[PDB]
Design a protein around this ligand. Structure first.
Ligand SMILES: [Zn+2]
Lengths: 210, 36, 145, 169, 40, 317, 48, 221, 50, 16, 208
């Protein structure tokens, strides 16, 4: 299964794959960083990090570029944050090859209360220790160090959690550009494919070394 | 209902609702290692 | 003993904060060295209560009665840039360098209420065509006179 | 002689839980209505999980903005249970969320942490006769998404009671 | 020096572990850099 | 056809959310007044940003502070330059771990630098001063935190041009750090963002470009200093906004554990920052207020950008 | 000096009533307790 | 909008530490009846001013004084903002609410020079009007602070006679969610009671009760 | 040890069984331990409470 | 007045 | 220090008090702890990362004609902790993380095998084996990312065939629990020498 017009860009050795599209003058770009620790199952039932990615939809008619922090759960799609950037899709904005995008900008309000909904089911978040310097041993890693993760708002919880009637129209506004749950069902399945191909390559490299 | 204004089935239901947060919220998972 | 939500419990009325600073500003007329404690008082009222045009106009009168001529007008210019109207109650009390405002609201002075009403009405007049820094600077000229 | 206090190097975090007598709390058995799993008893685990997803969360009591309790009555007249909701696939949930439930994008975003974990709808024992505690452990497909621990085995709707007996319901 | 001849055993301060932050010896405010100007 | 009614539904909702947002903070026509900073502090907030910086210059040393000047009436040294970086990073750690009794944890950084003027006469060359940009450019990076409206120190770092020269040349045996050299290889400048001036009211109309003057006062002094080519490595070392500056300050010592220090040292360091340096709990309570107010200000600009995007889609579709 | 969590330095006793002599304290011993080493930049001293 | 989280440091107790320091103790407060539906000055927090409440003149009495006025029943409009008034209630005189505390201290001549009509005697009937009846109620307490024997109030004056939908726009001052209140910033009390006063049992949108003392009920078990 | 033996059935997971009260009083040793004095055997296979 | 400011700040750009 | 021109008599007299008691104490060692054989310890005086380096030659069979020398490198970052969460958050457990580079015969992250291990409670716990550069599989797999490079799965969840071959590869390289105690011992001496310089550098800054 695959969406209508989306090319996949994945090289072996890096835990990253990027999806690109272009309809008219607008271009929508989806980047994902597959976790090395552990990823959740597609069945869901039975450290178990969710598959969270980004969506950069650029529109030159508006003059802004929309960054959409998306989390794929059970093949479906939720969106945690929407921020706006100046100009079209420059190369520095995408977090490929461990250089981040624009930093020191407003991340955006909470569109949904998903992270607080994981607290009642006792699912462990990405923040395992409250000490920020304890998790700064593995710096420049979004999964192990949430205090410098762009996708996790650098550990900050915003003031405003947006209105349900308002945030429903924002989800429908992005789903016409190809950020629907059909895209997240492929990203959920391709992340399990990258996670196995990275592990069997790292193992067979380790076999010839010793 | 005359003196106190409530009934004992209605007393037990409101007693369980005035403290719902401090009764049970988490599972308290994890492991604690000795530091000394 | 009765605890409201803390956004409604710890919020004093603005007439009380106006009267508390106007008691302190009347004490600044008798002794100008009281301003250092009023600066520590306003440093806590700004962070605990709400920054209203009533509490800012009383603080201009607190800075005026201490003899601070620069920062009193500069606080009034900040209210004009924030589109905040100057309080006509403290404008009548700025042009009256007597009448400690606890016994003004009590009614201990039966006379001079026509004078109290005249300064409130010209303060209503001066705000219609000018800003808040022009109303406050008129009150500081009469107070020092 | 000065005897040492018996401690452990590795102790789980739930052992620090407080009891007013520093002892094990009482395990009171459930009511007689939970003896046979019927249509009145099927959706009481679905009732409580939708209550916790709409109430205040945490030590600061953050109110959940979306109310998921309005979708409880339209869930039970269909006959779909919380245990039946875990058996629904991804294709069957999109049919349920758009057509039947009419779940919005923010209400589906708050219910999905309860579905992605496969939380078992088993009424745990408490010190009271009226229990509002569900086992929040993640379920496994070998034991029917019942998490397989503390006797929650493949048909157990309530702790301390009998099985489902799905031939009747 | 042994434990039984120590200052901590003269009071009821324990030998090792967390310091008693609400004890009166820990609540004594210390200024050791100024005692050469006072008691000299 | 269906893309027009979706983009017009979002543009009508974003116009209604911004109308209902300004209606909440409006008090009888008057908009929400921002919280007042302490005396001498000039807050600069870039529009569309996650941070705001405030500056403070104590002439003739620390004896010109607020606490050292108040006395009872009716009965030279080098100047100190302060800079408080305050990002929007504030979170509650009692949700992830309920054993911690913390309602609010907000982090903000403080950079204090010193500069020798030509007016001091007493202590000219008795000892060569290492705080000067000519000699080492020593600066103290005190990372602070506001833990339930209470200022707690996280780390006290002492960084000079030597630590930027060591990390770029001989941090390893014969080379620098392979990651610190790589982060200096990718340093693209940010586009100029229009800053907003929420300064102290007494210094709001005195002089406007004074923190801009004092920023280039040390910048021309350190690039033309005894340490010449190591200033691009030092500016990224002193870069308080981003992950490359936090990793570069992590390569340095970072100071000792403050709770492992002596209690006489902890009270004297708190007496220096709050009492002598002027960075007090009045400022520490103000930073969390200014982090809250400018989050509200950036939410309205976020609501204006939802309306600006959604109206631009429907007029073309 | 710097302290460590869980490790304390044992120190000898002066053998004068402990830290606080419950039997009593003389004048010249309490004279040093009177003029306690406070920082004099923020300390006001007064006698009548 | 959009559910701004609050900066107050109220917190529910944990699941590990015991309940201690019971000279202060929060509990939930629920009164007998609802009072949000009523008039503003007959609610629970204004119960001490019940005898200070003015007598109610109704609509049909106001239409009777419109047709057949009396020479000493002074209808007085207590609306403050001149921009929100559009029509004239008959036989009315304008006395704004912000100036009542200074108007009643005037003499008989100075009231004429400052308002253009004669000051009413202390024995005649005074009837006050407003938009919803809030500015007329606050003026009625100032009219009863001075020794005026007959002070009356028409609740919902302008909005019922002229059929308008306006308000007196009382702000009812509530702290903004950046303004952190008193007991977090301060060393006014010791650290144990400071932690226990800031403790609340449940959500912080409802009302609570603070106990000044408590004894353990040894007779249950 | 000091254990208690009940007459009616109380299983480890649920109370549902195929025995009566007259059966289980002979299975779980309630009839046994009532009629024997000290110095005799008691089975380990029967459940002991408290 | 805020949308007028945001076009001067550049947060609401024109057509690219 | 007269109080008229120097108002910080509470701090400047306190810090010079603590310079001498950290010097007059006899528990400290002025000599560094002796490393194991072959290792040479470099440390920049300003930074908090000290490097170890040695040359090493493996055991190769007689079918192989030449044995290539290796390059072993140790990178230890000093542990940071937040005292602002104290006394509410618990005391963080002491451990000594370090990096172990292996290069066959010029940098640190090119054609290098990187092994991340933790020394905690007197034993070594290997966490990840990170690769940098193009390596041979079985094709060529390139790991050109140095920050977000793929570190491999954690070895609790890894296969047991790759576990027992790694421990034989580490015990042959002589990195074990006795080497990890020196990393714990040298980190104490490095943090003590950096603390004494931190007290001296702070005295120049405050008194200026
Ligand atoms: Zn279970």
């Amino acid at each position: 299964h695959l969406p209508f017009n989306f090319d996949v860009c994945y090289e072996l050795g890096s835990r990253e794959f990027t999806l690109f599209s272009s309809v008219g003058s607008t271009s929508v770009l989806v980047f994902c960083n597959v976790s090395s620790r552990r990823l959740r199952s597609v069945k869901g039932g039975q450290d178990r990090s969710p598959v969270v990615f980004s969506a950069f939809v650029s529109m030159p008619t508006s003059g802004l570029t929309i960054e959409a922090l998306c989390c794929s759960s059970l093949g479906l799609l939720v969106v945690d944050g929407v921020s706006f950037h100046q100009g079209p899709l420059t190369e520095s904005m995408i977090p490929q090859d461990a250089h981040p995008g624009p930093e020191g900008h407003y991340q955006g309000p909470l569109l949904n209360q998903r992270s607080l909904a994981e607290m009642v089911v006792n699912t462990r978040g990405c923040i395992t220790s409250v000490d920020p310097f304890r998790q700064q041993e593995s710096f420049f890693d979004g999964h192990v160090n949430p205090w410098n993760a762009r996708s996790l708002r650098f550990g900050h919880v915003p003031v405003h959690t947006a209105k349900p009637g308002f945030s429903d129209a924002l989800c429908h506004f992005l789903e016409v550009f190809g950020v629907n749950d059909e895209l997240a069902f492929f990203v959920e399945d391709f992340a399990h494919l990258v996670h196995r191909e990275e592990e069997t390559a790292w193992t067979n490299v380790l076999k010839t070394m010793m | 209902m005359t003196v106190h204004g409530t009934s004992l089935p209605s007393t037990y239901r409101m007693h369980k609702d005035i403290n719902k947060a401090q009764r049970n919220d988490r599972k308290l998972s994890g492991n604690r290692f000795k530091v000394l | 003993s009765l605890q409201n939500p803390p956004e409604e419990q710890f919020a004093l009325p603005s007439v009380l904060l106006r009267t508390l600073l106007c008691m302190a500003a009347y004490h600044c007329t008798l002794d100008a060295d009281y301003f250092t404690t009023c600066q520590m008082l306003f440093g806590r009222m700004e962070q605990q209560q709400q920054t209203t045009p009533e509490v800012l106009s009383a603080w201009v009168y607190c800075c005026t009665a201490s003899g601070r001529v620069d920062e009193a007008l500069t606080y009034a210019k900040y209210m004009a840039d924030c589109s905040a109207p100057f309080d006509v109650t403290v404008f009548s009390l700025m042009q009256h360098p007597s009448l400690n405002p606890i016994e003004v609201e009590d009614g201990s002075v039966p006379h001079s209420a026509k004078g109290l009403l005249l300064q409130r009405r010209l303060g209503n007049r001066l705000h219609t065509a000018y800003r808040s820094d022009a109303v406050a600077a008129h009150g500081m000229f009469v107070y020092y006179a | 002689k000065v005897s040492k206090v018996p401690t452990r190097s590795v102790i789980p975090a739930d052992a620090l839980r407080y009891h007013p007598r520093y002892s094990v709390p009482r395990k009171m058995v459930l009511s007689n209505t939970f003896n046979v799993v019927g249509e009145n008893n099927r959706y009481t685990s679905l009732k409580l999980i939708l209550e916790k997803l709409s109430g205040h969360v945490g030590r600061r009591q953050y109110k959940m903005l979306c109310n998921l309790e309005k979708h409880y009555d339209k869930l039970k007249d269909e006959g779909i249970d919380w245990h039946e909701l875990k058996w629904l696939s991804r294709e069957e949930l999109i049919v349920l969320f758009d057509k039947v439930l009419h779940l919005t994008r923010t209400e589906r975003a708050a219910l999905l942490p309860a579905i992605e974990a496969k939380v078992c709808g088993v009424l745990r024992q408490t010190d009271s006769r009226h229990s509002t505690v569900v086992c929040m452990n993640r379920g496994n497909a070998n034991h029917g998404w019942r998490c397989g621990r503390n006797g929650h085995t493949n048909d157990v709707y309530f702790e301390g009671k009998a099985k489902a007996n799905t031939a009747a319901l | 020096i042994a434990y039984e001849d120590s200052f901590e055993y003269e009071e009821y301060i324990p030998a090792g572990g967390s310091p008693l932050a609400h004890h009166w010896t820990e609540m004594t405010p210390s200024f050791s850099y100024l005692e050469d100007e006072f008691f000299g | 056809v269906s893309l027009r009614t979706i983009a017009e539904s979002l543009g009508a909702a974003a116009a209604a959310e911004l109308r209902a947002e300004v209606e909440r903070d409006t008090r009888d026509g008057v908009a929400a007044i921002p919280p007042l900073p302490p005396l001498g502090w000039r807050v600069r907030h870039p529009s569309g940003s996650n941070y705001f910086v405030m500056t403070r210059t104590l002439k003739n040393g620390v004896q010109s502070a607020e606490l050292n000047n108040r006395r009872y009436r009716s009965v030279s040294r080098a100047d100190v330059h302060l800079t408080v970086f305050a990002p929007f990073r504030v979170y509650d750690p009692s949700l992830h771990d309920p054993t911690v009794d913390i309602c609010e944890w907000s982090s903000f950084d403080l950079v204090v630098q010193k500069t020798v003027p030509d007016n001091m006469v007493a202590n000219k060359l008795l000892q060569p001063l290492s705080c000067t940009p000519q000699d080492g450019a020593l600066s103290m990076y005190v990372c602070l935190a506001s833990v339930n409206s209470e200022m707690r120190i996280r780390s006290i770092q002492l960084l000079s041009m030597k630590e930027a020269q060591a990390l770029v040349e001989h941090a390893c045996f014969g080379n620098g750090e392979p990651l610190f050299l790589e982060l200096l290889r990718r340093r693209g400048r940010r586009r100029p963002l229009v800053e907003r001036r929420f300064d102290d009211p007494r210094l709001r109309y005195e002089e406007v470009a004074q923190p801009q003057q004092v920023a280039d006062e040390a910048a021309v002094a350190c690039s033309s200093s005894c340490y010449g080519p190591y200033y691009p490595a030092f500016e990224m070392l002193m870069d308080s906004c981003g992950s490359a500056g936090e990793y570069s300050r992590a390569l340095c010592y970072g100071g000792p554990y403050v709770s492992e220090l002596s209690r006489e040292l902890c009270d004297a360091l708190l007496d220096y920052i709050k009492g002598d340096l002027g960075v007090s709990d009045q400022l520490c309570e103000y930073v969390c207020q200014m982090q809250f107010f400018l989050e509200q200000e950036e939410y309205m600009t976020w609501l204006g950008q939802v309306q600006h995007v959604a109206n631009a889609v429907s007029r073309t579709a | 000096a710097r302290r460590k969590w869980g490790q304390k330095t044992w120190s000898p006793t002066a053998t004068n009533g402990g830290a606080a002599p419950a039997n009593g304290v003389s004048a010249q011993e309490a004279l040093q307790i009177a003029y306690r080493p406070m920082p004099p930049s923020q300390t006001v001293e007064y006698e009548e | 909008q959009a559910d701004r989280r609050t900066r107050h440091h109220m917190m529910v107790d944990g699941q590990i530490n015991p309940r201690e320091w019971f000279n202060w103790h929060p509990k939930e407060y629920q009164p007998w009846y609802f009072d949000r539906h009523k008039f503003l000055y007959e609610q629970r927090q204004y119960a001490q001013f019940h005898h200070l409440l003015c007598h109610q003149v109704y609509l049909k009495d106001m239409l009777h004084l419109m047709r057949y006025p009396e020479p000493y029943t002074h209808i007085i409009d207590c609306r403050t903002s001149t921009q929100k008034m559009h029509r004239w209630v008959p036989h009315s005189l304008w006395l704004p609410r912000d100036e009542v505390e200074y108007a009643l201290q005037l003499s008989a001549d100075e009231f004429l020079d400052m308002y253009g009509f004669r000051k009413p005697d202390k024995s005649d009937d005074v009837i006050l009007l407003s938009h919803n009846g809030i500015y007329s109620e606050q003026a009625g307490w100032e009219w009863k602070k001075q020794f005026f024997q007959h002070v009356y109030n028409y609740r919902g004056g302008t909005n019922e006679l002229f059929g308008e939908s306006y308000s007196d726009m009382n702000v009812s001052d509530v702290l903004s969610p950046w303004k952190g209140p008193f007991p977090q910033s301060g060393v006014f009390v010791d650290k144990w009671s400071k932690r226990k006063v800031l403790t609340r049992t449940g959500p912080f949108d409802r009302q609570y009760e603070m106990q000044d003392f408590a004894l353990p009920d040894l007779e249950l078990e | 040890v000091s254990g208690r033996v009940y007459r009616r059935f109380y299983g480890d997971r649920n109370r549902v069984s195929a025995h009566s009260t007259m059966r289980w009083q002979h299975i779980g040793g309630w009839k046994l331990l009532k009629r024997i004095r000290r110095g005799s055997l008691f089975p380990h296979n029967v459940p002991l409470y408290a | 007045d805020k949308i007028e400011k945001w076009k001067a700040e550049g947060l609401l750009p024109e057509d690219y | 220090l007269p109080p008229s021109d120097f108002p910080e008599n509470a701090l400047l007299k306190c810090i010079e008090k603590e310079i001498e008691d950290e010097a007059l104490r006899l528990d400290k060692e002025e000599c560094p702890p002796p490393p194991p054989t072959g290792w040479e310890m470099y440390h920049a005086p300003g930074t908090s990362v000290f490097y170890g380096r040695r040359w090493w030659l493996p055991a190769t069979a007689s079918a192989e004609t030449r044995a290539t020398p290796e390059r072993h490198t140790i990178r230890v970052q000093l542990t940071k902790r937040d005292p602002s969460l104290d006394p509410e958050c618990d005391v963080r457990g002491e451990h000594f993380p370090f990096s172990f580079f292996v290069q066959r015969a010029l940098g640190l992250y090119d054609q290098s095998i990187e092994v991340r291990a933790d020394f905690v409670d007197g034993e070594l716990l290997v966490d990840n084996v990170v690769f940098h550069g193009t390596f041979k599989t079985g094709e060529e797999v390139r790991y050109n990312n140095i920050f977000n490079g793929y570190p491999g799965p954690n070895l609790d969840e890894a296969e047991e065939e790759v576990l027992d071959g790694l421990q034989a590869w580490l015990a042959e390289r002589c990195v074990d629990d006795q080497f990890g105690e020196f990393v714990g011992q040298y980190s104490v001496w490095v943090e003590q020498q950096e603390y004494e310089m931190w007290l001296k550098r702070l005295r120049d800054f405050v008194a200026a």
